[PDB]
Amino acid sequence: MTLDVWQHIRQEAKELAENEPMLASFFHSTILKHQNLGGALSYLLANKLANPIMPAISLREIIEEAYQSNPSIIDCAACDIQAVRHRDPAVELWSTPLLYLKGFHAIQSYRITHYLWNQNRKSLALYLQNQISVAFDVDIHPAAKIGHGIMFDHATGIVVGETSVIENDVSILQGVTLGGTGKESGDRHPKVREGVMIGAGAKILGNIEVGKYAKIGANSVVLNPVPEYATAAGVPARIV
Amino acid sequence: MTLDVWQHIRQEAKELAENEPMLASFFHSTILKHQNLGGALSYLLANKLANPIMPAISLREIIEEAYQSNPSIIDCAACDIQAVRHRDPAVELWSTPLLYLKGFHAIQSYRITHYLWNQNRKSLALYLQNQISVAFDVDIHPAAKIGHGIMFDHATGIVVGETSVIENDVSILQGVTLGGTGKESGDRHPKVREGVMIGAGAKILGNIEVGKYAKIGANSVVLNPVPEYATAAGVPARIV
Amino acid sequence: MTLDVWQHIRQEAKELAENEPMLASFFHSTILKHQNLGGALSYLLANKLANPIMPAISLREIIEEAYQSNPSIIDCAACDIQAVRHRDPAVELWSTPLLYLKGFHAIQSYRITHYLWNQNRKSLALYLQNQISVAFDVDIHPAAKIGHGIMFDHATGIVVGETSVIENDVSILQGVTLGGTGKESGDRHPKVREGVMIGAGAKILGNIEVGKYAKIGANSVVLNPVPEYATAAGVPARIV
Amino acid sequence: MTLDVWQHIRQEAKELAENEPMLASFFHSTILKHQNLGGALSYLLANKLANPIMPAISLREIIEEAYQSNPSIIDCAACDIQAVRHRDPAVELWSTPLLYLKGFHAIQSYRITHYLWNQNRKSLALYLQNQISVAFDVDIHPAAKIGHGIMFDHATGIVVGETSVIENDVSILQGVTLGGTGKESGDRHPKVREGVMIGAGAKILGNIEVGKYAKIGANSVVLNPVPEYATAAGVPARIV
Amino acid sequence: MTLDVWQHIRQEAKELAENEPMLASFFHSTILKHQNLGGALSYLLANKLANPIMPAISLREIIEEAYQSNPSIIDCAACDIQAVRHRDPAVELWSTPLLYLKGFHAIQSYRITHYLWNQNRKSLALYLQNQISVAFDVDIHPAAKIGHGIMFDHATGIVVGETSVIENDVSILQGVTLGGTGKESGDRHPKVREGVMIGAGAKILGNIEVGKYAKIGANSVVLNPVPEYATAAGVPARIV
Amino acid sequence: MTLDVWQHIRQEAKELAENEPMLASFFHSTILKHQNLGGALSYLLANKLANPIMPAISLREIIEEAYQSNPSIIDCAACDIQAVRHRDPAVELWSTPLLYLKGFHAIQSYRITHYLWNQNRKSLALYLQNQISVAFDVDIHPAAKIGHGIMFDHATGIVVGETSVIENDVSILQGVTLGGTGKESGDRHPKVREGVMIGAGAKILGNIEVGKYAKIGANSVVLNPVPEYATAAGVPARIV
């Protein structure tokens, strides 16, 4: 759910704190001192997206407004923690995604830029979009539509276009682009349907469909729609 | 003119700050309190490249010395702005490249390293080269020869070699490498001629010529010279 | 020998500091004021991994305990220095790898995480794994087994799986992944043997053998064992 | 009224920013981007009381829970702002006490510590009392009872004891101590009545009455009750 | 004694952390994560004295060297903690002097400057003496000889001269100077003997004796030797 | 000459750096990397005055503007340096006032606020005045008229009124106030003529003349004019 992902997170944090004295202050600052997942998540992102021109204090306020003006955002964060947890068997702790995984952080920071975008506060959405790219090395245009249960593993170098759509339970690895072919304007980015898995370095270009539960091979260049439950691979990509 | 670009930037920022209270101090610190593009660019790069050992205040002095010794560096920055603008229908504001795009930032920072390199202040050149890599995720060798009207779109993972040449109006997407095959010294990096557009993740290796206005497809490995206006794609690349 | 590398680095530093006044305090803070390489390295890594939640002062004490429980980690560092040095004719000074190259840094930082992993201090190793990802854009799982004389050139986008092995004298470029094909647990990552060189963007997936002195061509996708001294290239890769 | 004061301050801010481009960002971050006085006051205070161990972001959440449990601390601030402005002919703008006067900052900070203390959250009240001393050079025991319309002019070196009382519209200059004589416990500090003005350097020791509207001359040491509207001066002091 | 004071401090910290979640990180960072009192003290001082040109990381290494080469400093720290605890009735906890009191902090910082002075590393001693004056508003020349059991209560504006001597169990309040009359060189500062209590604002000028257990009245100017167990007062000071 | 004071400062700095490796970075950032006193001083003051809202990089540009418009200001700094050099036999290095004495730092910082005040940039003058009070614990109204050859020894707690006049070669100790009696406006502060020396804690109130080369005793309250070369002591002060 959400309140109980929070509780499991709080309960792990106390243990983790007990077993690692060099990291207690860290567990207290990021999780233990907060009352809800929102307080913690905002504290983390604001600190991580912070810089000398726009300090953490100035960014937290901005994040907490979006959390109050749209609490679903936090729920979507909770569904993401669960996703990474259940889809990356190397992850056992519920707190791990929240504390350490930059992909997860970029996803949740993007949700905030999307909210701002839909509120027409574009210069602020752009500022964050790009600071997200600096901190996490993930560039998601605020206008993309991204569901929940999302996992951006390792994440470095992922780029997502303005008109891209990413449905629920999608997993994307490092270096993939959901970009364009060349049509400078209009619907021109991929529509990645549910359950899709995208291999490291894959380039998906155009306003084309990636059928649900498809698998996209590492480094493939996907230029044509992909049938559901199929595997595409190669350069350019073909079903195999 | 550089001066007109500045005038447009200032105008935009006055209205941008009107429309967004949360971000007004930002527009003010980055643009409105400055009297020309150089003071602004130096404030922006200094801050973005700053870190605990070499802070903003220490870096700005170096950048400002460079702009004063070679004024035209600012000129190329303004020509790169127009470029992104003209080449990206997504970018309506002149201020955007300047304030937010890490690729733009990486290029301008490189120009400073290039001036330092040509003046044989190479350790400083290497310092900045690498801090550009840390902050923007772009690694451009100071010896690289880069013209203007350039666009590093998204930019993450762009690596450019010591003997590479990039002439005007070139466009490079994330993940591309202009590198070598393994001759360890001498002229061994690409020659990207005017108007060339390089797709996301392309690897162009060797002292080979990439022809003006030629197009390189995503994830293509280019090991052979590409004719002007031609399109190269595949791994290895072939003329399509 | 370490003491000798250290000695070369110090004499280079006094020289460097004299020729570039603007960087003198830098050479003193990072090299001259320390009495051995671990002092320099720790100060350098602490400062680069520092963030507002865990400051340099806290990180340094963790790094220094590691260097005390295992002085050889510092020895592997001098070894990596020698390697970048003679495996790239563009690096001439011994101080260069230590002071500037994020690949070098990510690797020595990973060594600390690896020692933490074997001390069963995983929350800490995980924290650092991911800060290294944020700071240098290199994501190496603490459990990976890596030798010395290692070169991570440019480094941006390198991801190394939990069960990966990277023997001595290997060179890896930007964008390469050492990952899995989808077996969720158990041995599932690459065993890269000695002397191997991996080109830009290659993705090597699966618990497969990459024979000593093998060479992987850029953007390749290696899914089958690669013979010793063989060259592989393509999507998917073929012994070439 | 607080909203009145808030209004004049916002108004001054817009004009202040307009008249000094170099400080516009400061005006926007401290006053303009906030919707009320507590928001601005919490930002100014968290920022100024910040330190490497407890940064602004951590302190502002604390100041804000206090403003929420006891909104009347904010009113008192407004009232204190009216006082400096109207007892200091040299302060013409409402925004001045709020933005620049450490005496004013010290007082509103103590107020937070007072609330905490009565909430029996003493370690937190003590942490703040002492950071207030470090930042503003005013040391005020949290248990002290301090009214409104108070002016701590210049403020440097003011010290207020645990059992002290300071009623409304009192003025206190730099270097004054409201302390004790040596009775180590119990009511043992000055009762400073309304409208009382204390000149620079005076030491007022013991559980004694300082009469309503009395005046203490500089450097006097007051060890005996002071009649209302009377002037005391000398070492020791005597009614003059 | 040192190890016992340290355990009581560790014991209170664990308790204080449980009772104030908002401050737990602070208690772990300042106390709990350290193995001894010297590791905690150094963390505190390095952080408090820190500034943008000489960061905490750099100061800590300098303080730890001193504690390594002369361990008694920490012991004198424990003895001071004890002092404030038996001499200020308004101070229950052992952890308080160590965690919040700037006079305590100033004193411990001076001990490091006195050590460096005695090792003739005078630039380092002067840098700190002055940074101690900036952070705690206490200016103690490194050459003064100060014993233990010392209590600088409130402390703002305390100034101690080059040849001053302060013996064990002395108490000094805010604003006092142990200074000179004007002989520009030689022995020229007060010799404050054991058990002396100096009231707020007193100025003790000259190389005169302040007899053991003497009491100096607030704001007094002491220009002549003071008899033991006597009480001096006035400007200029005379007995009782 | 200012240039000779500079050459001497550089000279000492080069040797100080040789002798103290822990502070070499400091000598280099503060002195050796600059080309004139202006550069060093602006760098020093910008860092000392920086805070989270108004960073070092933002303040230096303010100071450098001031130095470029009234170069005489730097000349006044060199004069204040020599003054501390021989009026304080404890100080023999020309670099000491410059690098470590906060009273010097405050005087020089005041000069910048005075230039700003006389240019009607009063909000900027007020921001600095008070940041000077927080940084150095010295509060000097920007309008006060101060000459050169000044020395504020220790300096803590010095407060100087709006109409105060301080001519050349004056010496002021900690805790002294040049303040008013209560006439709320007009000419209401002391006129301190040349060579005057003021003891610690003295309070001089009202528009009264302190005659050249007069001497003021510690803790005095001067309420009546002081003849040239006279000595005044007491509460109130009498002529001695």
Short mmCIF file of N, CA and C in Angstrom, two decimals, chain C residues 12 26 63 85 105 112 119 121 144 154 166 178 219 225 228 231-232:
data_model
loop_
_atom_site.label_atom_id
_atom_site.label_comp_id
_atom_site.label_asym_id
_atom_site.label_seq_id
_atom_site.Cartn_x
_atom_site.Cartn_y
_atom_site.Cartn_z
N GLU C 12 55.90 16.13 -8.26
CA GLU C 12 55.15 16.70 -9.38
C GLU C 12 54.30 17.83 -8.86
N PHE C 26 45.16 24.17 -4.35
CA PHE C 26 44.57 22.90 -4.72
C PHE C 26 45.61 21.79 -4.54
N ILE C 63 36.61 6.29 5.39
CA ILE C 63 37.61 5.89 4.42
C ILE C 63 38.91 5.56 5.13
N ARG C 85 48.53 5.64 -16.13
CA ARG C 85 49.71 6.27 -16.64
C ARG C 85 50.23 5.56 -17.85
N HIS C 105 38.90 7.52 -9.50
CA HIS C 105 38.25 7.78 -8.21
C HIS C 105 37.16 6.75 -7.89
N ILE C 112 36.74 0.73 -1.19
CA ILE C 112 36.28 0.94 0.17
C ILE C 112 34.94 0.23 0.35
N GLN C 119 33.19 -6.80 5.34
CA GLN C 119 33.19 -6.64 6.79
C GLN C 119 31.72 -6.80 7.22
N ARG C 121 29.39 -4.87 6.45
CA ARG C 121 28.83 -3.56 6.76
C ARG C 121 28.19 -3.09 5.42
N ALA C 144 31.30 -7.00 -6.41
CA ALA C 144 32.10 -7.29 -7.58
C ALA C 144 33.51 -7.52 -7.11
N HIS C 154 37.35 7.75 -19.05
CA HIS C 154 36.18 8.61 -19.25
C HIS C 154 35.14 8.15 -18.25
N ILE C 166 36.53 -8.70 -12.57
CA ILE C 166 37.35 -7.91 -13.46
C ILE C 166 38.77 -8.16 -13.04
N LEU C 178 28.36 -4.46 -17.40
CA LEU C 178 28.74 -5.85 -17.11
C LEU C 178 27.49 -6.32 -16.32
N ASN C 219 29.79 -0.48 -28.66
CA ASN C 219 28.35 -0.79 -28.75
C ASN C 219 27.98 -2.22 -28.95
N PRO C 225 30.42 -16.47 -24.59
CA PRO C 225 31.81 -16.53 -24.16
C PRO C 225 32.74 -16.01 -25.25
N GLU C 228 40.09 -16.27 -25.51
CA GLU C 228 41.27 -15.48 -25.18
C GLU C 228 41.80 -14.91 -26.50
N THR C 231 38.75 -11.03 -30.73
CA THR C 231 38.11 -9.75 -30.78
C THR C 231 36.64 -10.06 -31.05
N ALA C 232 35.74 -9.39 -30.32
CA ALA C 232 34.31 -9.60 -30.54
C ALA C 232 33.70 -8.30 -30.88
#
